[PDB]
Design a protein around this ligand. Structure first.
Ligand SMILES: Nc1ncnc2c1ncn2[C@@H]1O[C@H](COP(=O)(O)OP(=O)(O)OP(=O)(O)O)[C@@H](O)[C@H]1O
Ligand SMILES: [Mg+2]
Ligand SMILES: [Zn+2]
Length: 246
């Protein structure tokens, strides 16, 4: 039929994780890849609760960060039986903490997207949902259990607009103005880069902060922030949004 998984959704507004179960069927070979990961077509065979699966503490995320109730979640509708979606694995290592940190990062970016839209720019944006999944049916050699992340399938022409280290790859205005927006309105505590997806539906972003801690692998601290600065040229969207040219 398919394999079981423990599914984790993060909800920023309560600052907690929701723990569920699902069953899934994953193609054998990847359809795409980048420098970090490989992506696999997958189909959903249903979402359920985690009651059969002892949490068994030792714990990460810790008990105080987990919601005792899970009846409200996006997974129920976005990953219902029959859905096509995408599963990602890291290229040849890693860490339990890492996967949870990537999903948390994408959720933070979704919040940034809604903040940008509230300003009424000419084009509105959206980041996809992302989820952590423990592939419990698969064998552990260093005793490491198998983990991954999953997200919806984007239909259409996928394009990368900027990288995590200073490259500007297309002419569009919206993706570069959004990056600038997050740097200025966060009081330079943070910036969102690696803006990529179909039209303005984006996924797999990267965040840099000054002290370089947190937010997984592509966080290049002060060095990444500086690279974005060097190549940025503000556009009509930067201006409509009243951002500083400096
Ligand atoms: N949700 C999605 N739907 C369709 N295709 C996708 C999706 N996510 C990723 N891809 C494709 O898979 C490729 C690799 O995925 P992803 O970008 O997450 O890996 P990566 O190694 O982190 O890349 P990057 O260097 O951009 O961080 C993407 O460039 C894109 O072609
Ligand atoms: Mg990519
Ligand atoms: Zn600008």
């Amino acid at each position: 039929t398919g394999e079981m998984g423990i599914l984790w959704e993060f909800d920023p507004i309560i600052n907690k994780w929701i723990r569920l179960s699902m069953k899934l069927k994953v193609e054998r070979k990847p359809f795409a890849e980048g420098a970090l990961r490989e992506a696999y077509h997958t189909v959903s065979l249903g979402v359920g609760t985690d009651e059969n699966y002892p949490l068994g503490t030792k714990l990460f995320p810790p008990i105080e960060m987990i919601s005792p109730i899970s009846k409200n979640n996006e997974a129920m509708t976005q990953l219902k039986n029959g859905t096509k979606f995408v599963l990602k694995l890291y290229k040849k290592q890693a860490s339990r903490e890492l996967y949870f940190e990537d999903v948390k990062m994408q959720m933070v970016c979704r919040d940034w997207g809604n903040k940008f839209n509230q300003k009424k720019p000419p084009k509105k944006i959206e980041f996809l949902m992302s989820w952590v999944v423990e592939l419990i049916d698969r064998s552990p050699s260093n005793g490491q259990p198998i983990l991954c992340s999953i997200e919806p399938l984007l239909v259409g022409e996928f394009k990368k607009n900027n990288s995590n280290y200073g490259a500007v790859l297309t002419n569009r205005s919206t993706p570069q103005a959004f990056s600038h927006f997050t740097y200025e309105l966060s009081n330079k505590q943070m910036i969102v880069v690696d803006i990529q997806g179909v039209d303005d539906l984006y996924t797999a972003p990267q965040i840099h902060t000054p002290d370089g801690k947190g937010f997984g692998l592509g966080n290049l601290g002060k060095a990444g922030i500086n690279k974005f600065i060097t190549t940025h040229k503000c556009n009509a969207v930067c201006a409509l949004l009243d951002l500083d040219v400096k």
